[PDB]
Design a protein around this ligand. Structure first.
Ligand code: K
Ligand code: K
Ligand code: K
Ligand code: K
Ligand code: K
Ligand code: K
Ligand code: K
Ligand code: K
Ligand code: K
Ligand code: K
Ligand code: K
Ligand code: K
Ligand code: K
Ligand code: K
Ligand code: K
Ligand code: K
Ligand code: K
Ligand code: K
Ligand code: K
Ligand code: MG
Ligand code: MG
Ligand code: MG
Ligand code: MG
Ligand code: MG
Ligand code: MG
Ligand code: MG
Ligand code: MG
Ligand code: MG
Ligand code: MG
Ligand code: MG
Ligand code: MG
Ligand code: MG
Ligand code: MG
Ligand code: MG
Ligand code: MG
Ligand code: MG
Ligand code: MG
Ligand code: MG
Ligand code: MG
Ligand code: MG
Ligand code: MG
Ligand code: MG
Ligand code: MG
Ligand code: MG
Ligand code: MG
Ligand code: MG
Ligand code: MG
Ligand code: MG
Ligand code: MG
Ligand code: MG
Ligand code: MG
Ligand code: MG
Ligand code: MG
Ligand code: MG
Ligand code: MG
Ligand code: MG
Ligand code: MG
Ligand code: MG
Ligand code: MG
Ligand code: MG
Ligand code: MG
Ligand code: MG
Ligand code: MG
Ligand code: MG
Ligand code: MG
Ligand code: MG
Ligand code: MG
Ligand code: MG
Ligand code: MG
Ligand code: MG
Ligand code: MG
Lengths: 201, 64, 117, 144
RNA sequence: CGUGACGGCGCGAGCAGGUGCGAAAGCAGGUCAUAGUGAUCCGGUGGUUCUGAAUGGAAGGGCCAUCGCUCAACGGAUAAA
RNA sequence: GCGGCGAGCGAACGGGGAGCAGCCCAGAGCCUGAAUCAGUGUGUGUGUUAGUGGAAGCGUCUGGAAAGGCGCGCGAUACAGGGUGACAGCCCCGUACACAAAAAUGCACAUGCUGUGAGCUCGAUGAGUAGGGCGGGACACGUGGUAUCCUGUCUGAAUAUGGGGGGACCAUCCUCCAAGGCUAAAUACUCCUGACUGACCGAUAGUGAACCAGUACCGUGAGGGAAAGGCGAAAAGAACCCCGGCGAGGGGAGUGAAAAAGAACCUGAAACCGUGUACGUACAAGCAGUGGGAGCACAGCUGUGUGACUGCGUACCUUUUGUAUAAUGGGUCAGCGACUUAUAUUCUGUAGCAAGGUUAACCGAAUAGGGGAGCCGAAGGGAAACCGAGUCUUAACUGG
């Protein structure tokens, strides 16, 4: 399989199993959903009837008063009472099998190629850490909302992209499934392509 | 937490190849003189747990 | 994710109370009572779609009887005569003619009498 | 392929039962518990093996047997495991190094299960009659 | 094969070994049949090509035979009301 | 394994990780002040306790007001966040980034001063103790065949040619050296301080307490314990006039985008209570509706309102063999109020891989990658030794 470079006007040979496989939507959906579950903090609580502040005194005697029977001022039936099934902090993360994570990545990258959203370049860099330079470079290549995957994290490039909210810059080892789907285009350097190929076997 | 085995059940049932359970017959501990040899001989080999009882045994033996 | 019930609860109660307009007292004002009244009105309406077909046939038959006896024949003999004459007009139409076209109804009675003779 | 165009496989996400939410749901009021009795109560139900008070099955039957400590340190080896060791000599140590038997196994027996197609030397293990035939027929040998 | 929710209980030709009676064909795995009974646990006694916590033994355990309950509220809550 | 062998209780060996560190007295001689820690001064760094600078926007439309629409520009290592008369990268405060300490103080070095002793040699090697009898307790281990540990009571060794342990006990072998002591790190927690975050709450929720709340109030006392948030962008919080008791309250005027935003103040639901209009209703018997239906009013034959007269018709929930039941529960409205969460296990669906599948802690800056310690599966039979596509039974199976 040949990926056509855009800045050098050549070709690059990649594995068909990484970049030319079918889209497994059911597999990609599970991995994307697990990624968002992994981002949850899960920090909350309410108070059960045991934790509401108050005394254990029976509000009134069992029989004779003509009122419904009461046992605790903290009953969840009562205003100011406990929460019946009060929440505790939770860990929402899911397990993803190693082979399912990698399988989903290969499905996503292959679909990016079919939809013409993967752009391979020989080099992508800026001379100075200036946002204005990267904005001009992206305007020249008709890009606006783009994920940029480099082999080595150029320090000038990373700084130049910080204040551009539609633009992200990563190294090949830091790609994630949600980012590959979320950006309009994905720009990879030839060097990053090899690293991703080797990473996904 | 982990389910706890009913330890008394583990001492009386063993799981067989297709997933049933073998057990030892009752009535062969004592009061043996008045029992016929034929009756005692047929109580010596192990037997399988019947269909109605499998649900009770499986509940007691989650790690069998 | 706490969910407050007010907006949805208000819409449900209002939907029932709107169906209870015209009812007496708490039946048009108070949700607990209006709900029971709306259900009972629905039960009656189901029952009375069936009753309506009975009551109207009963009315048509009574009017055919009166018009037939004005022409000298009972309802039961009139219906038998029409059936022997192969006339398939139904009671809704026979009752309509009995009121609005007494001359045509007389002609039907004569047809029934001839088939019986 | 966007974050708002991905769908799960059909049949993979069945909705959970929600008891006690009205007539139309089919689980309103009693929530599938029936009427009254111990099993309808919060926290209700009898323990495992309870039969109502009749001597239960796991107590009217007798205990039998004993548990052998030697069985816990004995293992069985398949013929298909013989090619998995490193070096063509199969013994207790090389089986442990290849993760075929546990670290505390002291006795192992090779049985006729699967196939061996390469010559191997088995040393210090017991071998069944059928496995010895298959090993030697494949060009190997057994050393006591 | 019968009969039981189950635990169980019952009837059984025939096979191996060894036996009694009969000249022999044969009959005999108690009694004309259907009541005469008590699960499990815990232990006792004898046997045993099983086990034996470094090793050889041993103790203890297993297996086979057998013993101890008007647990009679007789499927037997406790050793003890 | 323990266990009225019931309910239940529940290891270790061994393996993978985090972290890692060893020393002294029971004593003399030599050699000496040598290691090492503690203290106290002094330096150098590095924090903490105030702070400094910090980019870039105008025109026009709607509007009470522009940050919004439309047009054309500009900054960005700064598009974190907050404010400003509606939603602001460029109005304001910040933010990225770059700097700052007279004085006090933390830390890590360095270097003084004080104490401490380092090394070699030769010795020494913790007695009312170990062990035992009796009674208890602790060990996963309930006295059991019960090792081991602690000791209230009564006793009582050997002491290196010696002693402890290896789960009753003995022999053999192996291993260790009690009856003196010190020791960082990996571990536990948060009254308190700073920063940041949330598929956490948003005034009956969230702290009991968003508000002068552990208050008011209750109790002899210990103690118990509330309710109660929102005018507007800005008070511009209504000069003056009128009725009234120099009232309360109101009507004007004025402010304001708005005063049914006027302080009993955003929105302003429902129960409940009124005024006005249309139709019905004083000869008529009951769950009050429903089916039929005249007349009247209204708006454009129809739509809306009303409903004379007439067929049928004993609420709901619960509990029950069965309820109009004179059985239960509800005065009404609004708000809240009940199958959850964690872990283990089995079955179904679905996805991955497949005779294999998958990692845990942990490492890692990493939702990657590493980590296969393990767990499940590909073999069973037998109480077990053991045998193994067979095995058990039995002296042996025609067998089972
Ligand atoms: K409440
Ligand atoms: K960015
Ligand atoms: K059910
Ligand atoms: K041992
Ligand atoms: K009884
Ligand atoms: K702003
Ligand atoms: K003991
Ligand atoms: K309180
Ligand atoms: K409160
Ligand atoms: K207003
Ligand atoms: K009001
Ligand atoms: K009526
Ligand atoms: K009720
Ligand atoms: K009742
Ligand atoms: K009753
Ligand atoms: K009553
Ligand atoms: K499950
Ligand atoms: K599955
Ligand atoms: K067989
Ligand atoms: Mg009390
Ligand atoms: Mg609360
Ligand atoms: Mg991983
Ligand atoms: Mg016995
Ligand atoms: Mg909310
Ligand atoms: Mg409702
Ligand atoms: Mg009302
Ligand atoms: Mg109303
Ligand atoms: Mg149902
Ligand atoms: Mg029931
Ligand atoms: Mg009920
Ligand atoms: Mg019942
Ligand atoms: Mg309860
Ligand atoms: Mg392993
Ligand atoms: Mg006789
Ligand atoms: Mg007899
Ligand atoms: Mg006992
Ligand atoms: Mg024995
Ligand atoms: Mg031994
Ligand atoms: Mg009984
Ligand atoms: Mg500035
Ligand atoms: Mg503008
Ligand atoms: Mg506004
Ligand atoms: Mg010593
Ligand atoms: Mg000792
Ligand atoms: Mg002692
Ligand atoms: Mg002792
Ligand atoms: Mg003692
Ligand atoms: Mg002593
Ligand atoms: Mg010992
Ligand atoms: Mg031993
Ligand atoms: Mg509150
Ligand atoms: Mg509110
Ligand atoms: Mg007081
Ligand atoms: Mg005034
Ligand atoms: Mg407002
Ligand atoms: Mg208001
Ligand atoms: Mg109102
Ligand atoms: Mg009269
Ligand atoms: Mg009248
Ligand atoms: Mg009346
Ligand atoms: Mg009636
Ligand atoms: Mg009754
Ligand atoms: Mg009735
Ligand atoms: Mg009654
Ligand atoms: Mg009544
Ligand atoms: Mg009633
Ligand atoms: Mg009730
Ligand atoms: Mg009652
Ligand atoms: Mg009652
Ligand atoms: Mg009542
Ligand atoms: Mg096996």
């Amino acid at each position: 399989m040949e990926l056509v470079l855009k800045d050098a006007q050549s070709a690059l040979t990649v594995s068909e199993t990484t970049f030319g496989r079918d889209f497994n939507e059911a597999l990609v959906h599970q991995v994307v959903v697990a990624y968002a579950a992994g981002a949850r903090q899960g920090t909350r609580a309410q108070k059960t009837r045991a934790e509401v502040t108050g005394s254990g005194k029976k509000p009134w005697r069992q029989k004779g008063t003509g009122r419904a029977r009461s046992g605790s001022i903290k009953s969840p039936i009562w205003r100011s009472g406990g929460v019946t099934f009060a929440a505790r902090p939770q860990d929402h993360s899911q397990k993803v099998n190693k082979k399912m994570y990698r399988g989903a990545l290969k499905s996503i990258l292959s679909e990016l190629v079919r939809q013409d959203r993967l752009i391979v370049v020989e080099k992508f860099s800026v001379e100075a850490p200036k946002t204005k330079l990267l904005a001009q470079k992206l305007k020249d290549m008709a890009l606006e909302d783009v994920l940029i995957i480099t082999g080595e994290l150029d320090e000038n490039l990373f700084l130049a992209a910080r204040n551009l909210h539609k633009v992200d810059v990563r190294d090949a080892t830091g790609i994630d499934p949600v980012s590959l789907i979320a950006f309009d285009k994905v720009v990879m350097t030839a060097d990053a392509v090899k690293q991703v190929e080797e990473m996904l076997a | 937490p982990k389910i706890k085995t009913v330890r008394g059940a583990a001492k009386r049932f063993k799981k067989t190849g297709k997933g049933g359970f073998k057990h030892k017959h009752a009535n062969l501990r004592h009061i043996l003189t008045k029992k016929a040899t034929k009756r005692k001989r047929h109580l010596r080999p192990k037997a399988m747990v019947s269909k109605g009882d499998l649900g009770l045994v499986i509940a007691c033996l989650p790690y069998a | 994710a706490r969910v407050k019930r007010g907006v949805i609860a208000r819409a449900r109660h209002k939907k029932i109370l709107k169906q209870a307009k015209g009812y007496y007292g708490a039946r048009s004002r108070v949700y607990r009572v209006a709900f029971q009244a709306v259900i009972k009105a629905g039960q009656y309406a189901y029952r009375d779609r069936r009753q309506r077909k009975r009551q109207f046939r009963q009315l048509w038959i009574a009017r055919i009887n009166a018009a037939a006896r004005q022409n000298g024949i009972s309802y039961s003999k009139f219906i038998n005569g029409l059936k022997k004459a192969s006339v398939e007009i139904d009671r809704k139409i026979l009752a309509d003619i009995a009121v609005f076209d007494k001359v045509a109804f007389t002609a039907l009675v004569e047809k029934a009498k001839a088939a019986l003779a | 392929m966007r974050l708002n165009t991905l769908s799960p496989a059909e049949g993979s996400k069945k909705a959970g039962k929600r008891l006690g939410r009205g007539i139309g749901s089919g689980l309103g009021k009693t929530g599938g518990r029936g009427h009254k009795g111990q099993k309808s109560r919060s926290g209700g139900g009898v323990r495992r093996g309870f039969e109502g008070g009749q001597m239960p099955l796991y107590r009217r039957l007798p205990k039998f047997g004993f548990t052998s400590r030697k069985a816990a340190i004995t293992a069985e080896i398949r013929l298909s495991d013989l090619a998995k060791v490193e070096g063509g000599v199969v013994d207790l140590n090389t089986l442990k190094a290849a993760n075929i038997i546990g670290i505390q196994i002291e006795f192992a027996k090779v049985i006729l299960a699967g196939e061996v197609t390469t010559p191997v030397t088995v040393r210090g293990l017991r071998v069944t009659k059928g496995a010895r035939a298959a090993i030697e027929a494949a060009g190997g040998k057994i050393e006591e």
